[PDB]
Write a protein that binds this ligand. Structure first.
Ligand SMILES: CCOC(=O)CC1(n2cc(C#CCNS(=O)(=O)C3CC3)c(N)nc2=O)COC1
Ligand SMILES: [Br-]
Ligand SMILES: [Cl-]
Ligand SMILES: [Cl-]
Length: 269
């Protein structure tokens, strides 16, 4: 009884770090935007299994963790064989893993008569990824706290957006480790910026994790510089590696990408 579900990516339309929390760990402000860029997930009745087309081991897979935890918290034994075709590259700063977790858990929770409630499902996926509960609502939301405290917003942003993803996998942990006092802003500063972005002022986007990721991973910087050369303002999603801009891909971009092994994703918002 196999079904297919799409699992969307996000971009961060701006990110600010307010400071360190005892638990690791950083308080942030960000604007999440869902983008029409999807992993395809085939769910079939069978023995619990989570496979991808890109060799993520089952034990490492957020979706598998999530479904084992579902078993724990619910006392129901899950009989679903999961295959995920990963178009959203891990380490691209687009929340593909967290998306997979949220959508699969939401689906399996329905397919099993809805044992968990909206707030529980959210606490479950949220426990694994701070990221992950944005994907239970989608569209556009402000993330506060560590990204889990969400406020749905209506954005005045539309038209072409292009993603340029280099074949470096940004380690978010290594990015947060280059953070210094100098990178933090006040929440009031960030809230004014986000308001402006929400009203369609894309030039107000900025992200210190991107600034850092460009220093640590020279290839992110190479893409950034290339996008400027092409005559667009570049921006960085998550803590990289993705660079995006508000325009279309030229043939010269497509050529540079094929040659360098960058993925170019043209979308419309
Ligand atoms: C143990 C030390 O490492 C960390 O805690 C850094 C990490 N982190 C991650 C956070 C997050 C989040 C979700 N929003 S987001 O768009 O994906 C943003 C790119 C992080 C966060 N708010 N604070 C953090 O400190 C854990 O994943 C990166
Ligand atoms: Br610091
Ligand atoms: Cl079978
Ligand atoms: Cl690099």
């Amino acid at each position: 009884h196999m079904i297919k579900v799409l699992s969307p990516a996000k971009i961060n339309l701006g990110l600010w770090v307010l400071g360190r929390l005892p638990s690791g760990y950083h308080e942030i402000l960000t604007l999440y935007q869902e983008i029409p860029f999807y992993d395809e997930i085939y769910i079939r009745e069978g023995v619990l299994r989570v496979e991808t087309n890109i060799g993520i081991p089952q034990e490492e897979n957020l979706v598998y963790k999530g479904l084992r935890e579902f078993e724990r918290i619910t006392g129901i034994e899950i009989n679903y064989s999961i295959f995920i075709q990963k178009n959203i590259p891990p380490g691209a700063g687009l929340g593909g893993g967290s998306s997979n977790l949220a959508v699969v858990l939401k689906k399996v929770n329905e397919l099993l008569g809805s044992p968990l409630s909206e707030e529980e499902l959210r606490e479950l996926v949220g426990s694994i990824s701070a990221d992950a509960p944005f994907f239970l609502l989608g569209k556009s939301a402000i993330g506060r706290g560590k990204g889990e405290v969400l406020e749905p917003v209506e954005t005045e942003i539309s038209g072409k957006i292009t993603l340029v993803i280099p074949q470096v996998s940004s380690s978010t942990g290594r990015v947060y480790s280059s953070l210094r006092e100098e990178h933090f802003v006040t929440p009031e500063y960030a809230e004014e910026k986000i308001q402006r972005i929400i009203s369609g002022e894309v030039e107000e986007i900025e992200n210190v994790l991107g600034d850092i990721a460009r220093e640590l991973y020279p290839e992110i910087n190479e893409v950034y510089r290339f996008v400027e050369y092409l005559g667009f303002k570049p921006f960085v999603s998550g803590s990289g590696s993705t660079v995006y801009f508000f325009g279309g891909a030229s043939e010269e971009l497509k050529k540079a990408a094929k040659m360098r092994g960058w993925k170019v994703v043209e979308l419309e918002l």
